[PDB]
Scaffold this active site. Structure first.
Site, PDB file in Angstrom:
ATOM      1  N   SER C  42      38.071  40.792-100.008  1.00  0.00           N
ATOM      2  CA  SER C  42      36.820  40.390-100.626  1.00  0.00           C
ATOM      3  C   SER C  42      37.017  39.082-101.407  1.00  0.00           C
ATOM      4  O   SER C  42      36.121  38.669-102.137  1.00  0.00           O
ATOM      5  CB  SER C  42      36.234  41.510-101.521  1.00  0.00           C
ATOM      6  OG  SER C  42      36.679  42.931-101.215  1.00  0.00           O
ATOM      7  N   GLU C 140      31.878  41.945 -92.957  1.00  0.00           N
ATOM      8  CA  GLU C 140      32.057  43.301 -93.461  1.00  0.00           C
ATOM      9  C   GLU C 140      31.221  44.255 -92.605  1.00  0.00           C
ATOM     10  O   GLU C 140      30.116  43.908 -92.190  1.00  0.00           O
ATOM     11  CB  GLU C 140      31.675  43.391 -94.943  1.00  0.00           C
ATOM     12  CG  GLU C 140      32.492  42.454 -95.828  1.00  0.00           C
ATOM     13  CD  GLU C 140      32.886  42.937 -97.210  1.00  0.00           C
ATOM     14  OE1 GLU C 140      32.918  44.172 -97.439  1.00  0.00           O
ATOM     15  OE2 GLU C 140      33.101  42.062 -98.069  1.00  0.00           O
TER      16      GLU C 140
HETATM   17  C1  LIG Z   1      36.431  43.368 -99.973  1.00  0.00           C
HETATM   18  O1  LIG Z   1      35.942  42.690 -99.107  1.00  0.00           O
HETATM   19  C2  LIG Z   1      36.901  44.705 -99.619  1.00  0.00           C
HETATM   20  C3  LIG Z   1      36.158  45.474 -98.803  1.00  0.00           C
HETATM   21  N1  LIG Z   1      36.742  46.510 -98.183  1.00  0.00           N
HETATM   22  C4  LIG Z   1      36.575  47.881 -98.650  1.00  0.00           C
HETATM   23  C5  LIG Z   1      36.089  47.871-100.116  1.00  0.00           C
HETATM   24  O2  LIG Z   1      36.956  47.934-101.004  1.00  0.00           O
HETATM   25  O3  LIG Z   1      34.866  47.796-100.323  1.00  0.00           O
HETATM   26  C6  LIG Z   1      35.689  48.725 -97.705  1.00  0.00           C
HETATM   27  C7  LIG Z   1      36.453  48.917 -96.392  1.00  0.00           C
HETATM   28  C8  LIG Z   1      35.336  50.079 -98.335  1.00  0.00           C
HETATM   29  S1  LIG Z   1      34.109  47.861 -97.286  1.00  0.00           S
HETATM   30  O4  LIG Z   1      33.014  48.159 -98.405  1.00  0.00           O
HETATM   31  O5  LIG Z   1      33.603  48.452 -96.025  1.00  0.00           O
END
Ligand SMILES: *C(=O)/C=C/N[C@@H](C(=O)O)C(C)(C)S(=O)O
Ligand SMILES: *C(=O)/C=C/N[C@@H](C(=O)O)C(C)(C)S(=O)O
Ligand SMILES: *C(=O)/C=C/N[C@@H](C(=O)O)C(C)(C)S(=O)O
Ligand SMILES: *C(=O)/C=C/N[C@@H](C(=O)O)C(C)(C)S(=O)O
Lengths: 265, 265, 265, 265
Positions: C42, C140
């Site tokens: 993220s 995402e």
């Molecule tokens: C940041 O981009 C991280 C995203 N990945 C996870 C999170 O911590 O939110 C997931 C995989 C849960 S995402 O919301 O699908």
């Protein structure tokens, strides 16, 4: 019926309790023993700074003040360390608010000048803000071992609210200075457990505490609702019943704030 | 006079509002339209998990359940990602509580079995906990677009409080399972601006939210005082006045919680 | 010998770890696997906002953007709640930074336009800032389940540091916008346990986190010394060894920050 | 590496600096002028309490000690106020640690008995803990105003560390008493800007400060990592170059602690 909720806290915590919130555009004031006298404790340090802000230009805060080891009679967590180095008015005010430093307080009173060590000068300042009732004679530490009933070094919730209101919300200070004072109070270290802990986190709270013997514990604050509506909250307590050595209960001050938050929301 | 404060919020926010807190060892219950019907929205997902916990052994949470891309009708941020992979009952429950995943909800209802997609099975469960009034008829998303007055898919604050009480505080579940559910609710993501924001930070709060059309917005919670005293707080609202496409006001839910915190402190 | 302290943490936490701090007027840079590739997670949401700030006038943040229930594919705590109401670009950016909202991210990419859903437009933006290595392909949630070794959706500590430096400290954005971005990062909710927790309290820290599978965990930040000296700190990790379902260790990120704070003090 | 970082701070702050951390199960000790002499200042008040805890039963703390107005020679924020009331050994110890009260210190030395005002008795106590180098000759205030090079009233970082280690972590005291001392140090008021400010907040820190002329400034502490690993940190400084009237730099002590935190993490 809010009267009855305060009387409850009184009974639980074995304390007498004084509460004032002024009226607003919308809301009616909140009174409970609001016109009864209580000890100032360290709460008078708020206006004190304002008096020093009022008396002198804004660059006056750079003036360094020296002092001796035997000038520290009160508890003074900041003054203690800066005996060698000295301290500027600016740093003195910061400490007096943020840390409730007792020595600084006395130095600042001296900065006001006049007899009483500057307590008359300061008494005079309150009158300029239309404060008749509040009265102050001695300094730290001597003032915070005065016995119950003694009307020296005392005020009412009603009174001190109306002072804090004029300073912070009113036009009692130029914006620049006003700003400074709010900034300082916004960053008070000594007030986490009292008014701050009775309000929800989404309220903004700036406060100045007071503590002493006979379970004496006060907190005066300005709060903003989650939509930026300002309110002034004076809370004062004591427990003179359990004598000199009675411990103050912050929990009392936090609980009351919660009742108040309830009517204000 | 607390009656009058709720009616105020009602008028400010242009909404009908339902509030229930059960009675305790000391305090009397708090009622305001407590026996009026409101829409569940996503609030029924709390007991739903409990129903699945109740009906099956504890190792049942490992059973993987698969589904298709076209099984995703509602908002489903977790179901969306695990379409090919599937998901265990265990992870389904987590999601349903913590993220209010709408698909999972429907899968779990199917785990209960019976007609209505498992809505009868679930309705049946509530009766086991002595809940007469509550009804559930459709699934997500269709249930959140029921018109006002329609008694399908509805409950009272009074009712759902007494359910949540029995689950969390009462012996409606074995300790191990009870533990799980509290843990999940303790870690809800969807509830920051409602009940949680109306209480002071030194209170512990676990909650489950609900949202829908006609400005529908609910939150049910257990709270602990700063001294670990538990209370159940059911808050429900709607704004059927501005029609189907009326926007919900979380502000309303947060404000009421504050009034409630006031009486409880 | 700082090399050896990072390799220690690596062994303790069973993880690969990448660290970069650029050079200053005084100090030499800090490198450790600084030129190795890691997953963005993220973290790319920081420049992303900047790209949207860069492309459009400042009034553009008021444009309201609508979306559907099935446009929420990722975890999206704020998009969730504002499906009925919609959200302005301004609010979208706040969320993307402060809450790491996944949906918003994707909406903003769409605001950039171009193929890839706007991932090319964004990839293009980085090159404008002289960033060769960084690559972005998917959105995402799909990007967070890329396997180890796959060079799509990746960057180096060295690279992303030099981006963040130009944005915040450099003249890559007009002051007004720059201000906004810092304000947002200053108020990140998702970062308490990582870089923030490795520095002393008297340091100022603004950060943007990243998490994913294979124990993936990143944090990029600007810090100010107690005397207002700025530094840029890129920290990146993973644990691809324990497979897809390996848990990230914030402890690792907090420990490294502490080593770094040590050389910077 | 780290040797060169301390020599840097030395040059920046125009000061000589002494640092000691003992070795542990894992880590090797940290030495920098560790075997050089420095002034105690108020740091000796820590063992002093321990010496009074050691010599007498546990109920001895209730013995009230009275004194005169002209017994108050040093800085004494608590002794000043309790001249009329007197003070128990128990209260004396609290003050000596928490507030660095200079009078109390002298009273307690007198409680040890022996020539030198009890300074020999106390010097004797350190030898019981295997401390050869440390010596004490005068009392407050006179001891803080004796020149550089003079070996009276002095110690090494190495030495005082090994004392503090045995007291707090070691079996130098029964658990009950040990408990008391830690509790007191845990609640020190005088130490915020020194060792405490150099460590991250997630570390636990208990400390005892020292200040004087010739820019003399010390802090000794026990710290626990975020995972409860204990360490002893002795930091001592002076600035005999700028003569008697040289100002101490707490900043120096805070900066070094940060380097140390770095190696320990
Ligand atoms: C940041 O981009 C991280 C995203 N990945 C996870 C999170 O911590 O939110 C997931 C995989 C849960 S995402 O919301 O699908
Ligand atoms: C202001 O609230 C009072 C400052 N301190 C006093 C207190 O009781 O809190 C003392 C007595 C510690 S101070 O030495 O006067
Ligand atoms: C729980 O509160 C309800 C979630 N429902 C959503 C769904 O997709 O089914 C909506 C969008 C209908 S509602 O706005 O919450
Ligand atoms: C202990 O280090 C404190 C001693 N108190 C003072 C004294 O007058 O002896 C000083 C000046 C040494 S310190 O600056 O507070």
């Amino acid at each position: 019926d809010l009267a009855d909720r305060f009387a409850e806290l009184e009974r639980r915590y074995d304390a007498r309790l004084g509460v004032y919130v002024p009226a607003t555009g919308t809301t009616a004031a909140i009174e409970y023993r609001a016109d009864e006298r209580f000890a100032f404790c360290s709460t008078f340090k708020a206006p004190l700074v304002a008096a020093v802000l009022h008396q002198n230009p804004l660059t006056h805060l750079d003036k360094l003040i020296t002092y001796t080891s035997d000038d520290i009679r009160s508890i003074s967590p900041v003054a203690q360390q800066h005996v060698q180095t000295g301290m500027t008015i600016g740093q003195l005010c910061d400490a007096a608010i943020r840390y409730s430093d007792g020595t600084a307080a006395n130095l600042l009173l001296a900065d006001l000048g006049g007899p009483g060590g500057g307590t008359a000068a300061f008494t005079g300042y309150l009158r300029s803000l239309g404060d008749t009732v509040s009265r102050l004679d001695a300094e730290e530490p001597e003032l915070n071992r005065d016995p119950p009933g003694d009307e020296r070094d005392t005020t009412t919730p009603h009174a001190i609210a109306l002072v804090l209101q004029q300073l912070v919300l009113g036009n009692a200070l130029p914006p620049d200075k006003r700003a400074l004072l709010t900034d300082w109070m916004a960053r008070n270290t000594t007030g986490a457990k009292r008014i701050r802990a009775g309000f929800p986190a989404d309220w903004k709270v700036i406060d100045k505490t007071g503590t002493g013997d006979y379970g004496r514990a006060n907190d005066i604050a300005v709060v903003w609702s989650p939509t930026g509506v300002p309110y002034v909250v004076a809370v004062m307590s004591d427990r003179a019943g359990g004598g000199y050595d009675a411990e103050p209960r912050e929990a009392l001050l936090a609980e009351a704030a919660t009742c108040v938050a309830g009517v204000l929301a």
